[PDB]
Write a protein that holds these residues in place. Structure first.
Motif, PDB file in Angstrom:
ATOM      1  N   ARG B 223       0.838  -1.146   0.150  1.00  0.00           N
ATOM      2  CA  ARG B 223      -0.050   0.187   0.204  1.00  0.00           C
ATOM      3  C   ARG B 223       0.874   1.205   0.099  1.00  0.00           C
ATOM      4  NH1 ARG B 223      -2.990  -2.642   3.518  1.00  0.00           N
ATOM      5  NH2 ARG B 223      -4.951  -3.788   2.456  1.00  0.00           N
ATOM      6  N   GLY B 224       0.409   2.471  -0.465  1.00  0.00           N
ATOM      7  CA  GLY B 224       0.675   3.608  -0.516  1.00  0.00           C
ATOM      8  C   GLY B 224       0.480   4.730   0.355  1.00  0.00           C
ATOM      9  N   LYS B 225      -0.426   5.326   0.144  1.00  0.00           N
ATOM     10  CA  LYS B 225      -1.145   6.453   0.829  1.00  0.00           C
ATOM     11  C   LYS B 225      -0.444   7.601   1.318  1.00  0.00           C
ATOM     12  CE  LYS B 225      -2.822   3.432   3.775  1.00  0.00           C
ATOM     13  NZ  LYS B 225      -2.372   2.164   3.329  1.00  0.00           N
ATOM     14  N   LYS B 226       1.179   7.650   1.009  1.00  0.00           N
ATOM     15  CA  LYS B 226       1.928   8.433   1.407  1.00  0.00           C
ATOM     16  C   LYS B 226       2.465   9.172  -0.093  1.00  0.00           C
ATOM     17  CE  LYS B 226       0.506   8.913   4.538  1.00  0.00           C
ATOM     18  NZ  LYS B 226       0.211   9.946   5.567  1.00  0.00           N
ATOM     19  N   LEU B 227       2.199  10.074  -0.510  1.00  0.00           N
ATOM     20  CA  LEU B 227       2.996  10.995  -1.452  1.00  0.00           C
ATOM     21  C   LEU B 227       3.728  12.138  -1.080  1.00  0.00           C
ATOM     22  CD1 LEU B 227       3.428  10.558  -4.585  1.00  0.00           C
ATOM     23  CD2 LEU B 227       1.386  11.862  -5.156  1.00  0.00           C
ATOM     24  N   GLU B 228       4.823  11.992  -0.698  1.00  0.00           N
ATOM     25  CA  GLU B 228       5.406  13.138  -0.375  1.00  0.00           C
ATOM     26  C   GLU B 228       6.730  13.323  -1.078  1.00  0.00           C
ATOM     27  OE1 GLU B 228       5.333  12.131   3.754  1.00  0.00           O
ATOM     28  OE2 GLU B 228       3.298  12.886   4.073  1.00  0.00           O
ATOM     29  N   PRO B 229       7.328  14.671  -1.136  1.00  0.00           N
ATOM     30  CA  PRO B 229       8.694  14.924  -1.659  1.00  0.00           C
ATOM     31  C   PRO B 229       9.785  14.063  -1.079  1.00  0.00           C
ATOM     32  CG  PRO B 229       7.394  17.042  -1.365  1.00  0.00           C
ATOM     33  CD  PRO B 229       6.770  15.984  -0.507  1.00  0.00           C
ATOM     34  N   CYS B 230      10.780  13.598  -2.151  1.00  0.00           N
ATOM     35  CA  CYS B 230      11.861  12.666  -1.468  1.00  0.00           C
ATOM     36  C   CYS B 230      13.120  13.487  -2.156  1.00  0.00           C
ATOM     37  CB  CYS B 230      11.874  11.323  -2.188  1.00  0.00           C
ATOM     38  SG  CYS B 230      12.153  11.352  -4.220  1.00  0.00           S
ATOM     39  N   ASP B 231      14.163  12.962  -1.615  1.00  0.00           N
ATOM     40  CA  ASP B 231      15.522  13.729  -1.950  1.00  0.00           C
ATOM     41  C   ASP B 231      15.739  13.972  -3.557  1.00  0.00           C
ATOM     42  OD1 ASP B 231      17.983  14.557  -0.411  1.00  0.00           O
ATOM     43  OD2 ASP B 231      19.060  13.167  -1.811  1.00  0.00           O
ATOM     44  N   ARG B 232      15.702  12.781  -4.298  1.00  0.00           N
ATOM     45  CA  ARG B 232      16.105  12.671  -5.342  1.00  0.00           C
ATOM     46  C   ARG B 232      15.269  13.432  -6.367  1.00  0.00           C
ATOM     47  NH1 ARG B 232      19.574   9.529  -8.911  1.00  0.00           N
ATOM     48  NH2 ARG B 232      20.594   9.800  -6.929  1.00  0.00           N
ATOM     49  N   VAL B 233      15.841  14.569  -7.264  1.00  0.00           N
ATOM     50  CA  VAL B 233      15.030  15.455  -8.091  1.00  0.00           C
ATOM     51  C   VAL B 233      16.001  15.399  -9.405  1.00  0.00           C
ATOM     52  CG1 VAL B 233      14.292  17.856  -8.507  1.00  0.00           C
ATOM     53  CG2 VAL B 233      14.599  16.861  -6.151  1.00  0.00           C
ATOM     54  N   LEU B 234      15.169  15.522 -10.465  1.00  0.00           N
ATOM     55  CA  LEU B 234      15.486  15.530 -11.905  1.00  0.00           C
ATOM     56  C   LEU B 234      15.492  16.884 -12.628  1.00  0.00           C
ATOM     57  CD1 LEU B 234      16.871  13.008 -12.954  1.00  0.00           C
ATOM     58  CD2 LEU B 234      15.333  12.439 -11.421  1.00  0.00           C
ATOM     59  N   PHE B 235      16.654  17.594 -13.119  1.00  0.00           N
ATOM     60  CA  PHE B 235      16.530  18.831 -13.946  1.00  0.00           C
ATOM     61  C   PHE B 235      16.864  18.509 -15.402  1.00  0.00           C
ATOM     62  CE2 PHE B 235      16.660  22.814 -10.924  1.00  0.00           C
ATOM     63  CZ  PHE B 235      16.559  21.841  -9.631  1.00  0.00           C
ATOM     64  N   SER B 236      16.026  19.335 -16.050  1.00  0.00           N
ATOM     65  CA  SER B 236      16.290  19.361 -17.626  1.00  0.00           C
ATOM     66  C   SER B 236      16.278  20.790 -17.908  1.00  0.00           C
ATOM     67  CB  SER B 236      15.190  18.797 -18.242  1.00  0.00           C
ATOM     68  OG  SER B 236      15.468  18.263 -19.724  1.00  0.00           O
ATOM     69  N   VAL B 237      17.532  21.179 -18.562  1.00  0.00           N
ATOM     70  CA  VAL B 237      17.928  22.371 -18.982  1.00  0.00           C
ATOM     71  C   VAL B 237      18.124  22.161 -20.400  1.00  0.00           C
ATOM     72  CG1 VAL B 237      19.330  24.573 -18.776  1.00  0.00           C
ATOM     73  CG2 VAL B 237      19.199  22.979 -17.158  1.00  0.00           C
ATOM     74  N   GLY B 238      17.014  22.636 -21.230  1.00  0.00           N
ATOM     75  CA  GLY B 238      17.190  22.437 -22.587  1.00  0.00           C
ATOM     76  C   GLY B 238      16.723  20.827 -22.860  1.00  0.00           C
ATOM     77  N   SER B 239      17.748  20.138 -23.510  1.00  0.00           N
ATOM     78  CA  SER B 239      17.921  18.859 -23.555  1.00  0.00           C
ATOM     79  C   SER B 239      18.669  18.066 -22.498  1.00  0.00           C
ATOM     80  CB  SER B 239      17.997  18.260 -25.008  1.00  0.00           C
ATOM     81  OG  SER B 239      19.286  18.776 -25.342  1.00  0.00           O
ATOM     82  N   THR B 240      19.677  18.814 -21.774  1.00  0.00           N
ATOM     83  CA  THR B 240      20.592  18.343 -20.784  1.00  0.00           C
ATOM     84  C   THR B 240      19.843  18.152 -19.453  1.00  0.00           C
ATOM     85  OG1 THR B 240      22.133  19.694 -21.976  1.00  0.00           O
ATOM     86  CG2 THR B 240      22.969  18.512 -20.003  1.00  0.00           C
ATOM     87  N   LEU B 241      20.138  16.747 -19.006  1.00  0.00           N
ATOM     88  CA  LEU B 241      19.685  16.298 -17.835  1.00  0.00           C
ATOM     89  C   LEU B 241      20.625  16.307 -16.586  1.00  0.00           C
ATOM     90  CD1 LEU B 241      17.123  14.568 -16.614  1.00  0.00           C
ATOM     91  CD2 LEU B 241      18.478  12.761 -16.938  1.00  0.00           C
ATOM     92  N   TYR B 242      20.216  16.569 -15.581  1.00  0.00           N
ATOM     93  CA  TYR B 242      21.054  16.652 -14.086  1.00  0.00           C
ATOM     94  C   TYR B 242      20.265  16.058 -13.182  1.00  0.00           C
ATOM     95  CZ  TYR B 242      24.157  19.885 -16.853  1.00  0.00           C
ATOM     96  OH  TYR B 242      24.862  20.526 -17.619  1.00  0.00           O
ATOM     97  N   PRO B 243      20.921  15.009 -12.319  1.00  0.00           N
ATOM     98  CA  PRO B 243      20.292  14.686 -10.947  1.00  0.00           C
ATOM     99  C   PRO B 243      20.932  15.255 -10.047  1.00  0.00           C
ATOM    100  CG  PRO B 243      21.867  12.954 -11.705  1.00  0.00           C
ATOM    101  CD  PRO B 243      21.824  14.018 -12.851  1.00  0.00           C
ATOM    102  N   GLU B 244      19.889  15.724  -8.937  1.00  0.00           N
ATOM    103  CA  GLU B 244      20.138  16.410  -7.851  1.00  0.00           C
ATOM    104  C   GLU B 244      19.407  16.044  -6.693  1.00  0.00           C
ATOM    105  OE1 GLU B 244      21.913  19.375 -10.715  1.00  0.00           O
ATOM    106  OE2 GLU B 244      22.498  19.052  -8.704  1.00  0.00           O
TER     107      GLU B 244
END
Ligand SMILES: Nc1ncnc2c1ncn2[C@H]1[C@H](O)[C@H](O)[C@@H](CCO)[C@H]1F
Ligand SMILES: Nc1ncnc2c1ncn2[C@H]1[C@H](O)[C@H](O)[C@@H](CCO)[C@H]1F
Ligand SMILES: Nc1ncnc2c1ncn2[C@H]1[C@H](O)[C@H](O)[C@@H](CCO)[C@H]1F
Ligand SMILES: [Zn+2]
Ligand SMILES: [Zn+2]
Ligand SMILES: [Zn+2]
Lengths: 421, 421, 421
Positions: B223-244
């Motif tokens: 089960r889930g019921k928890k949708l909260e922000p986590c540490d890993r985020v993805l950035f896209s500048v134009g077509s370039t990808l950066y994990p942060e």
């Protein structure tokens, strides 16, 4: 200084070329009435850009080449020309004809050396000459540092790239069609700016798609149940036909960072440098050794609208439904923003699109109108079923999705393989 | 005198550039069709501003540098270039190529010394040369007085600053993205003036956010019921990808006054000098000794509108709700003042926004209209539940908040850490 | 002859600057993009006025000074520079660098003497040099006759003035923000012409005031009862943060005549000479001996409209009410005279204000409209409850007061302390 391309004077694709290549001067000079002449003007400037951004005095490999194109240039190419397709022998004969027709008239080039090398290859058909050979991509042993791919679709990208990685090649280019429609796994589609239509083999007897043929009938009253995409796909560029496979097309949708680790190990990166309404140029750089980690995501930036929608058609008399994808210009997408706020019928959208439109071809309008109409309704249905923050209510129900719409200045992201051994 | 930047002639970001840098002449000179070219024009003027406001004849450290950018300059840099990312070997090879291509053609610079230093580092990979090294930011022992950070997101700010302060550094600069959206703990967002979208990893299969991809489906009953922000985020500048990571991004939101007290003690201040629609330049000054008290508040001034609103979407078939943040130009915010006096529907706001708008990108309009409509209703609900002066009635009930709107000429204030040991 | 100030060419504050200083001609010369640059232009001409109206060949004390400002002048200052703030070491370092950078290039000044005095102070940190010291205001023993205060808020006015009264000082100046909003005991407020907002510490988590930050929430069903102003207040000028206390701010609201009688006795007067939309310059004269009687009233003249109104907001989820004050331009107040004759709703007032308005910032309009609407109703309620001449009917009932409105060409009067011992 100006670059002459075979397009008509009053063509709207010229400004698209201008926006795509803002470092050359382009002037239209029409010669022949080619019905798929827009692709040649793009592949024409692509090679010039590649050469203008590559270091001088470098040896360049050429996978699946036509040597007549690289004869009047000034760089040291090496053409890999196997005989695997029915259209190769006349290419070789043409190269021979133009080699014989400039024996002494032109001397600025290396014509004498090329003729001698071709004669040596004709003598012993296993030799490896500076400028010609009769091997495949994984069997040529000519060491180099640059490789170029032009309209090559039948090779598996990891194995091919690894077989030039161990030969001193540190930079590669790939020019071709966008791979995005096959990552979404559609059944048929079009590239309307280049007069190209592609379709799966199981829908060739449809009625209202861009590549089909049907018959007249009255209607008879007399197992399957599985209509899903298959490997074999048919491409039609103008009037030329090409069979393709889905796996080899998908294999070129590479992530931003990946690792090739067999006997020798390399870390590779993939970037998109030029993109125009379906054509992309991809630059790949390779370096020995296992450097940092990989995520496994591929990203596509949308400068124009991308649509994928469900449609109902008749195939061989039987009524079925499947998905079709297409491209939409940015101006129409921007001018449709106000109308899509409310719920609209397909015919009203059709009339509005005809009023605004020629900028887009008229045979794609009826399906775009239906896709917009179905998207506007799902937006409203989402708006009226508000939920609570951060909680999921659960087995959980799934909803309908009949349209995928990627507006300009957005990005698609997919999960792919990143560890190749 | 004029500074040449790679932007198109008729670009609206040019006037914003003048408003942000009213001490230089800006002229557009387009070369390449870069799809994320607005960032370069800002980071290009920022370095000139820093150099024009720094004392001459000073040694400058460079954390995570690309030495090709600091080759044709006239100040004594020291580049810290560890090999931790897959794109570093190509940077080093390019530095080597541009060093070899100007062996004697250019002599106004220190090319010979740089080449000798690079060869010395290649010989023994532990040396500390005046201009180059292979160490981390907390391991380089080259003493200096100025440090510069450019697009550096993977370091923890207190430790990095403390390891720079004990080496004679009294002034540091940081150029990058605004940290404000991550202090509000949003789920996804955009920087529409630089063609950048970022999202949490758990919402990558959404439908109508700026960075997602979904599929077509019919709808299953299973089960889930928890949708909260986590540490890993993805950035896209134009077509370039950066994990942060969220923690390291938040660590750079520093208060006005703080103390670094380990073995040696320092008192530090943080101030913002340049802000443009998402990019900020921060100046940090450090001084030995524990001076007066700290409050622990960070303040952000808003020259444009900032919005954060709730929205309902479909992720992988399941209907959920989460928060999205964005930036709005000041002119639209000023011109929407009259309409927001009453209660308005989302579609009327959408039509009004389309009428006023291009100044803002069209793909963010539908969520801005919904945010404005929900804000106008909460204002009215506040107006009709008047209370008494200076008394709270109490357990006390909480109310709904679905929109946060920061108008121009306002300030946000947050509580952060100020005592670092 | 022209005075150059760092403001944009087309700024409306310029004409207010001429209306405030009709003895200088002002020309705008923009160099840096400072977000709170309007206060500097006022404090810039304030010093010019003070020097142009003071006798030549006089010694001037400077309480809490920045010596870099008073370096290229031509009058004999004495800078009192204690080390109590975290931003002082950088000021001292800047003074040292500016003194070292003009060792012999400039000789019209007293640079050599200043350098020698600074070196002597660095040698023995208890000396009293003509131009510098490391003492507070109550410990410096340098006798003088003129004192100047610039943006000084942390000193208690009677004790400070007494400690220079016994040192031969007969004239003092004070430049700063208007003290009137804190005599009315408001909870939050703005100075919209200088991009400044201030708030009490207990309302920092509000929603719609100019200095706050809140979160998104759904609403929970789960003692206080006293929401009153407290000592600690936060100021934000542009993006710079300053904490202050209410008592020390109120201590500078001095009556027209008062007496300082400790060991020696002095009779003192306070007068306001320059006033511009929130900034005031106050001149204080001192004379030995206890002269005639005192009343104990302080008077403020309003050249623009002053408003204080009740408002309902949500703080950390709980709905509360408190008071907010602001300034309104005179033209809008004059043009609103006709509408206020009848009873108007906040929506109509908002629309009318938007129609007339940019002259005032848009984020303050909604509270001004509510204040006007509430004032107009109380006027009518007063009009319809006429009483008899000279008789009070009585325990007596009190009425509601939700708005205080001081129109231009009016005066406020408050009772304060006048006997200081
Ligand atoms: N394994 C292979 N290695 C190298 N070249 C190959 C291979 N298979 C086919 N080709 C070539 C064909 O002969 C066509 O001519 C080329 C099409 C591009 O225009 C190219 F596909
Ligand atoms: N601990 C570290 N100390 C110094 N530099 C580091 C560190 N980690 C990563 N880097 C660099 C990477 O190599 C990238 O190249 C740089 C990205 C900016 O463009 C920078 F992040
Ligand atoms: N008791 C004091 N006597 C003299 N000066 C004092 C005192 N307390 C603080 N200061 C100074 C601080 O050092 C700041 O620098 C100044 C702020 C004005 O800009 C001023 F407040
Ligand atoms: Zn070969
Ligand atoms: Zn080093
Ligand atoms: Zn002194």
């Amino acid at each position: 200084d100006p670059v002459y391309v075979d397009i008509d004077a009053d063509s709207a694709f010229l400004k698209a070329l201008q926006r795509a290549y803002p470092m050359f001067e382009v002037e239209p000079r029409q010669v022949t009435p080619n019905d798929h002449a827009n692709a040649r003007a793009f592949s024409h400037l692509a090679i010039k850009l590649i050469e203008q951004e590559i270091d001088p005095d470098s040896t360049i490999l050429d996978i699946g080449s036509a040597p007549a194109r690289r004869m009047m240039s000034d760089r040291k190419y090496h053409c890999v020309c196997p005989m695997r397709s029915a259209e190769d022998p006349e290419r070789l004969a043409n190269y021979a004809r133009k080699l014989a027709s400039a024996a002494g008239k032109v001397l600025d080039r290396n014509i004498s050396g090329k003729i001698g090398d071709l004669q040596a290859v004709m003598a012993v058909p296993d030799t490896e000459t500076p400028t010609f050979c009769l091997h495949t991509d994984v069997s040529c042993r000519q060491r180099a540092d640059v490789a170029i791919y032009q309209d090559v679709y039948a090779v598996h990208a990891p194995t091919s790239l690894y077989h030039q990685a161990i030969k001193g090649v540190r930079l590669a280019y790939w020019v071709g069609f966008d791979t995005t429609p096959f990552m979404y796994n559609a059944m048929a589609g079009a590239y309307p700016s280049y007069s190209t239509n592609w379709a799966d083999e199981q829908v060739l007897k449809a009625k209202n798609i861009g590549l089909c043929s049907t018959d007249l009938t009255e209607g008879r009253r007399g197992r399957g149940k599985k209509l899903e995409p298959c490997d074999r796909v048919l491409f039609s560029v103008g009037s030329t036909l090409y069979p393709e496979s889905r796996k080899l097309l998908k294999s070129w949708h590479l992530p931003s960072v990946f690792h090739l680790k067999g006997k020798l190990s390399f870390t590779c990166r993939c970037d998109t440098v030029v993109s125009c309404e379906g054509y992309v140029v991809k630059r790949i750089t390779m370096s020995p050794g296992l450097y940092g980690k990989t995520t496994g995501y591929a990203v596509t930036h949308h400068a124009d609208g991308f649509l994928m929608c469900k449609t109902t058609d008749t195939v061989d008399g039987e009524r079925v439904s499947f998905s079709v994808c297409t491209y939409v210009p940015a101006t129409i997408c921007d001018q449709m923003t106000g109308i899509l706020a409310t719920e609209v019928t397909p015919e009203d959208a059709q009339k509005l699109l005809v009023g605004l439109n020629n900028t887009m071809k008229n045979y794609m309008i009826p399906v775009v109108a239906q896709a917009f109409s179905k998207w506007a309704k799902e937006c409203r249905k989402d708006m009226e079923d508000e939920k609570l923050l951060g909680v999921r209510e659960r087995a959980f129900k799934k909803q309908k999705t009949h349209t995928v719409y990627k507006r300009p200045d957005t990005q698609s992201i997919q999960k792919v393989q990143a560890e190749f051994d």
